[PDB]
Amino acid sequence: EKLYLGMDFGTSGGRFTVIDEQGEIKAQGKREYPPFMKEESMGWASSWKATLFSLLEDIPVTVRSLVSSISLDGTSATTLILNSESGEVLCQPYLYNQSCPDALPEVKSIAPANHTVCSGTSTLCKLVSWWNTEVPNRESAVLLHQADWLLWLLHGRLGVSDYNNALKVGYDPESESYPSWLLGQPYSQLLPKVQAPGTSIGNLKESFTRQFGFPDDCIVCTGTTDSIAAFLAARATEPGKAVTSLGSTLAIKLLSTKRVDDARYGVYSHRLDDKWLVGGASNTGGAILRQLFSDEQLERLSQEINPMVGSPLDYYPLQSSGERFPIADPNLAPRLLPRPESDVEFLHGILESIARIEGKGYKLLKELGATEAEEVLTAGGGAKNDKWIKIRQRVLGLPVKKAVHTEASYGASLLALKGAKQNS
Numbered sequence: 001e002k003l004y005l006g007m008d009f010g011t012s013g014g015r016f017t018v019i020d021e022q023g024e025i026k027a028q029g030k031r032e033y034p035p036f037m038k039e040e041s042m043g044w045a046s047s048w049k050a051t052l053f054s055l056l057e058d059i060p061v062t063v064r065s066l067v068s069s070i071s072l073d074g075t076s077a078t079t080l081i082l083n084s085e086s087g088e089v090l091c092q093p094y095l096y097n098q099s100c101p102d103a104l105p106e107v108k109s110i111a112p113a114n115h116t117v118c119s120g121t122s123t124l125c126k127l128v129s130w131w132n133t134e135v136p137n138r139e140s141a142v143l144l145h146q147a148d149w150l151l152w153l154l155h156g157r158l159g160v161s162d163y164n165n166a167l168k169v170g171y172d173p174e175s176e177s178y179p180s181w182l183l184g185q186p187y188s189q190l191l192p193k194v195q196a197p198g199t200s201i202g203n204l205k206e207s208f209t210r211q212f213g214f215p216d217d218c219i220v221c222t223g224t225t226d227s228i229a230a231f232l233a234a235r236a237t238e239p240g241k242a243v244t245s246l247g248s249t250l251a252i253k254l255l256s257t258k259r260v261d262d263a264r265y266g267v268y269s270h271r272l273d274d275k276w277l278v279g280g281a282s283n284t285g286g287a288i289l290r291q292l293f294s295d296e297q298l299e300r301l302s303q304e305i306n307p308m309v310g311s312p313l314d315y316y317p318l319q320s321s322g323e324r325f326p327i328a329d330p331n332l333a334p335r336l337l338p339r340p341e342s343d344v345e346f347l348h349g350i351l352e353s354i355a356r357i358e359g360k361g362y363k364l365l366k367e368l369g370a371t372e373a374e375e376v377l378t379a380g381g382g383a384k385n386d387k388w389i390k391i392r393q394r395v396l397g398l399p400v401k402k403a404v405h406t407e408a409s410y411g412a413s414l415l416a417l418k419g420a421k422q423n424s
């Protein structure tokens, strides 16, 4: 009977999924963000709010009447500052890909060497940058991540985040605390309390139950980031399970009983339940494929490939020089020579070489300490190529298949479900 709502506030719009406890989808939908008024100090936040309301209205009323728990994801390190008394957003949000280099020396001066916050786009650089603009009454401010803020609109309890959203401000999900090097600074007073992803915060506000017809006992749960929600959608929860995203770039995520963080390779871990999601990304993948072939050409040429035959071609397919993972070399050259006369042989070589890079990535994660990969699920455009799936199964020497779900909003609905089950 009960249903579970997940929303995904991504880079360009919002999406929602409603599931039952078995993971069957009962409603889903998407909305692009609307414009905001030039003079609106909330900026994009006013648009996100509008989208939230739109998405809620888009859920069928009968479905809304059964929704028992809500969670949502947002973009990583998208940062808002609010007044703690009035709820007022004090400036336009610092977007995920927005950088604050002015604050980076200060951050490097306080953080452990090569900490994940030591990047201009980190939540902590944004916090320090805002702090240092010396807004009157800055000590009465609070920081919220995008996901946190949208959830707070729903439950009305100011200042709660999750293990995943808070990583880029310096939160340590292993000790479940902010570290002393961060707590030692005065802007730490702005930091939100932090819970596990998908845990209950409070009941949905009466304004929403009355306006939209949600049941009175509907709860609102902490969320996560869009990247992690997308991983969660694959419904893989055991150590050794992995998801490869064959998108414009190649990204891999491996579930592990051991935490792995390594600056050389840009490898970073998030907490997931009682485990660690270990991630890395290569510049190889779909972008270079697209540079060489249309989607239709990839289709047709792929049907001429025998995926059980190994290509002799050793490529490192890149559009331009440079790699961080699984090779740390800013000057790593593309290698697409020799190029055979046959476009089928060329493509086979490219797909097989990208599979080698994938394999090398999983090997590197293992050697850095992660639980060894046991099964690889596939997301992204590349997942629709079954020939490539077979090639990758052979080259990786592991079972490979399609992830059944890949939408972040689906993963968020799983967090809503988790929160509800834990709550009862």
Ligand SMILES: Nc1ncnc2c1ncn2[C@@H]1O[C@H](COP(=O)(O)OP(=O)(O)NP(=O)(O)O)[C@@H](O)[C@H]1O
Residues within 6 Å of the ligand: 245, 246, 247, 248, 249, 285, 286, 287, 289, 290, 295, 298, 299, 302, 379, 380, 381, 382, 384, 385, 388
């Ligand atoms: N049949 C195919 N085989 C292999 N690659 C393909 C095929 N069709 C499309 N692609 C690639 O899929 C890529 C798009 O993947 P997609 O995953 O939608 O991109 P993205 O921008 O990274 N978004 P995301 O889904 O989050 O990874 C393009 O670069 C295409 O080259």
